[PDB]
Symmetry: D2
Subunit: 245 residues, 4 copies
Amino acid sequence: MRVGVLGAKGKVGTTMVRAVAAADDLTLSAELDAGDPLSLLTDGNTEVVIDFTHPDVVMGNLEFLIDNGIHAVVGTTGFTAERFQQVESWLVAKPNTSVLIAPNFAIGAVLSMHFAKQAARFFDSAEVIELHHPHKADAPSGTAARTAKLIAEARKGLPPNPDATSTSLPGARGADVDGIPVHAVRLAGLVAHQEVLFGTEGETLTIRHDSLDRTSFVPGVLLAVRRIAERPGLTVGLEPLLDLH
Amino acid sequence: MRVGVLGAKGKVGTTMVRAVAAADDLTLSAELDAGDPLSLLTDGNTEVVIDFTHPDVVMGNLEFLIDNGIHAVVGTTGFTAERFQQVESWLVAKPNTSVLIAPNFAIGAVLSMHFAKQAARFFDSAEVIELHHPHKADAPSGTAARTAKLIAEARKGLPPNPDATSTSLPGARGADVDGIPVHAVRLAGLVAHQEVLFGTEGETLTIRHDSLDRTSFVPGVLLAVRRIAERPGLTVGLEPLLDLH
Amino acid sequence: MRVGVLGAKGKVGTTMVRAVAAADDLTLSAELDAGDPLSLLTDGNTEVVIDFTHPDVVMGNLEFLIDNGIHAVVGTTGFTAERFQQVESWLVAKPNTSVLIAPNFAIGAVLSMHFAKQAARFFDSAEVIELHHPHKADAPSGTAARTAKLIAEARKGLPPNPDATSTSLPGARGADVDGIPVHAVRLAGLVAHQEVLFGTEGETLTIRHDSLDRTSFVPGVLLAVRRIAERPGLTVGLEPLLDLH
Amino acid sequence: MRVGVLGAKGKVGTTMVRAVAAADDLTLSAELDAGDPLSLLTDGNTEVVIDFTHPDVVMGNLEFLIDNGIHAVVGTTGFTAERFQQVESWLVAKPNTSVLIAPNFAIGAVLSMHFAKQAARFFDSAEVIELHHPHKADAPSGTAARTAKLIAEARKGLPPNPDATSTSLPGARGADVDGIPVHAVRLAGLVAHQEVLFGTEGETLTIRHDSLDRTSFVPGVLLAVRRIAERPGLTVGLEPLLDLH
Ligand SMILES: NC(=O)C1=CN([C@@H]2O[C@H](COP(=O)(O)OP(=O)(O)OC[C@H]3O[C@@H](n4cnc5c(N)ncnc54)[C@H](O)[C@@H]3O)[C@@H](O)[C@H]2O)C=CC1
Ligand SMILES: NC(=O)C1=CN([C@@H]2O[C@H](COP(=O)(O)OP(=O)(O)OC[C@H]3O[C@@H](n4cnc5c(N)ncnc54)[C@H](O)[C@@H]3O)[C@@H](O)[C@H]2O)C=CC1
Ligand SMILES: NC(=O)C1=CN([C@@H]2O[C@H](COP(=O)(O)OP(=O)(O)OC[C@H]3O[C@@H](n4cnc5c(N)ncnc54)[C@H](O)[C@@H]3O)[C@@H](O)[C@H]2O)C=CC1
Ligand SMILES: NC(=O)C1=CN([C@@H]2O[C@H](COP(=O)(O)OP(=O)(O)OC[C@H]3O[C@@H](n4cnc5c(N)ncnc54)[C@H](O)[C@@H]3O)[C@@H](O)[C@H]2O)C=CC1
Ligand SMILES: O=C(O)c1cccc(C(=O)O)n1
Ligand SMILES: O=C(O)c1cccc(C(=O)O)n1
Ligand SMILES: O=C(O)c1cccc(C(=O)O)n1
Ligand SMILES: O=C(O)c1cccc(C(=O)O)n1
């Protein structure tokens, strides 16, 4: 299988390049970063692309890829409904082309979101603390926001988090994501971390995920790269490839 | 519903007394502690008993209760397979009597055991750190041991935790519970806490439960007290009620 | 020693009442809550008062107390420079009257602030996560804000926390306290908790303090109540009574 | 300054090689791993050596180095009183040779040991949880053991940790280090982590250090490499350099 990487010089992208290069069943056929022509892709007869670039360019790369029938495994963040729709649109005229977009490729993260969904209804309180390296441009993380969305949707019909806050400094209570507070920590020394906190009378549940290293994202990505053509169209999240094995 | 409490003066037992006393749909009909006659139960027309006493006396109280058709919600620890056995044969002669024994009545704890079951097969490593107040007689906790049992059974067919330990002080690596290391911390200021740690390449998943207070055990207990007669015979665990596992 | 309590029916105040009542060397001589006359104090010949009330009334109570020469141990939050000054003022015409105001009376909290002061200069990043029960009116806590102040002052002359945040939801990055981000979590089941996070290349230092119970504030308070008259005037913080024994 | 590295191919050693190579004021003059002659050191005019090898070979390398007047910055673990002894008598015959041995070169770790020293006397309980990658041969870590030693010495004259344990699985309570329990976790995905837990009535203090990456040990090592000759003879610990203790 001929695999190309968009964002090859990036913190994550370079890690994927080594991963592909080292995979016995994959041929690294393209290494693009900022300012490299996309035809390098079509030129090396790339079959699938791993994209870890930027919210400002991903839709550009996606149109090209789908246009040329190249499958895409996308980790780049910032996707929205309209974006998904756009993708969803684009892919309609391009059947047999698969695009997989995951807010996080680490298994612990995927499991965390799963568990949070399950625990949400049993508690009175839920907040999300997210912790990342100081080079991350967006806060809160997409993973954190998506996790707040899931908790909120799972608690439909229940009252809101109890909060007697009457005076506070702006921002102390974090960002409101569908009524779930989300706090973003940007600290040197960190990579990617998230804590989901549930509380009720006299007890709390914490689901914590820690990416100590960017290699943590490779198994998930390569798993997707390999079974990409199984589900043609648009897949979101890794869950579909996991709640099997 | 007439509810009696065994271990009424205990750290947990007294909390249950207040809880029952305050429940609008329950009548506190008995308060027994060490040295109180069991007939105080039968004497007050008790229908259900909450037992938070001691491993050395629970079987004694259980025989009496079943004998007199009183239902039992038991939180007292130290139950074993053989123990689970006597209570059954005791009930067969007293069908229509229900006994519920739960290693933990806090919801977060029950959910933690559920999640650990689900995550076990996705990681190379699993260890359990358990933390309790310095008055706890047994280590590791029953909750921790049961959680190690579940993780082990969920990983049947997979290799053991990788460990290159070649020299160590005795005990440094914790207790072996079905091949899952369990560490017991006994510290002033704590109540009841447990951490489940899963690890694989470059990432870890931690499910942490904290009982900051003994009130955390009341909802679970009262839930069981109320639906006790829904299942005649023995019920081990709170799972069946929480409609999950 | 005749001790009176302001805020006697409060979450913390009631705990202090039991504490005083149980102290063999203290006489509980007054129990005031909202709507009780202050002369109850002067009426019972109170010598020292413990105040755990509200930012809106503390200055009122303080004027009376100082006016009548009653010493005050104040845990109520929301004090400011002008307030301190005001107190500082007031106390000038009232020598031999001592007032002790502490942002936190738990020893671990006092130690945490001490340690943070010491570690601040060794790291590139510092953030503060504070976690409290959902009845707390103010965010961030006074302890958290004071801790951010100390870290900032200890890092004078060093560059700011590195942060590449370019897009973010409002509040995701917390409150800015002297350039130190502070995040406030309000969750059911919690009492009073704080985490100080320091980060540099490939490592982090976390100093975590947990008040699992409001009794945690009693030793500190009673220590202050007893040695109150040692330092006449205004003392802030418990440190002066600790960096001895 | 001509710097050589012993254990150049090791997890940590290779990281030091890159660090030296990249330092503008240091010349990488030697790269030895298992089976490389020590004369490669003397051969390249090496002035200082960084040793991250193995307890079984460090004394061998130390004799050679001191013998030839090469300074040594040693991170390799397993040093003991008797060991500390040979190196001294070796140096007496080679004054002007400096040897620095540190159980940990990460700053957060050094600070953690400092703080634990300070907090020890204020609590009733102290335990140490240490967490490392599954390739570590020794448990508990030297850092953890040294930290338990310090806490114990700081609590001389005080009673022991209160523990009502009466029945337990072997090892559940950890290793005894001078009466301080130490627990060693070996988990995939981890690098080097330690938690110090102090507890007293209703509260706990936790000092947590996390090395998410082996780069975390470079600043400390290079700092020592550079000022090595400031102190002829033996220096145990990084404390003397950090101007603290
Ligand atoms: N879904 C997941 O599991 C994960 C998602 N991410 C996300 O993936 C992205 C990458 O993060 P990092 O690697 O830390 O960023 P980075 O520091 O690597 O920045 C992105 C890289 O891609 C390059 N690139 C930029 N524009 C490009 C273009 N138009 N075409 C091709 N290459 C281009 C940039 O030059 C740079 O090399 C971010 O949005 C991040 O939040 C990161 C880790 C995991
Ligand atoms: N399943 C769960 O969720 C939980 C289980 N437990 C377990 O429940 C038990 C109680 O824990 P604590 O309250 O902390 O202990 P405790 O020692 O404070 O409470 C036990 C009390 O019951 C009394 N009692 C003893 N023998 C009795 C007898 N023959 N008849 C009536 N009362 C008797 C004792 O004098 C004492 O008052 C232990 O086995 C503990 O491990 C504790 C918390 C939660
Ligand atoms: N410094 C420290 O270590 C600590 C400080 N606090 C702070 O102390 C205060 C108390 O917190 P909680 O006990 O949770 O609040 P709370 O829920 O007890 O509210 C305060 C109580 O004082 C009463 N009171 C109100 N106005 C009064 C007045 N004018 N005169 C006399 N009594 C009055 C109220 O009726 C209520 O009983 C808050 O500002 C809290 O943040 C809380 C714990 C520790
Ligand atoms: N003080 C500190 O801050 C730290 C100390 N350490 C300790 O440093 C040592 C190294 O740890 P790792 O790098 O993880 O182990 P490792 O086994 O990955 O590194 C050791 C390496 O040195 C090689 N080597 C062995 N014998 C040698 C010899 N006679 N001459 C030259 N090279 C030789 C081995 O082949 C291997 O390449 C251990 O004792 C570890 O506990 C590790 C991290 C930090
Ligand atoms: O969901 C996210 O935004 C996310 C997840 C992991 C890592 C990163 C990152 O390094 O930016 N971002
Ligand atoms: O599983 C247990 O043994 C357990 C769980 C919660 C509390 C206690 C306890 O307080 O003894 N014991
Ligand atoms: O510094 C604070 O504001 C603080 C500290 C401990 C407890 C509380 C509280 O219960 O409000 N508030
Ligand atoms: O104190 C120790 O033994 C220690 C400290 C940090 C890392 C390692 C290691 O990687 O072996 N060992």
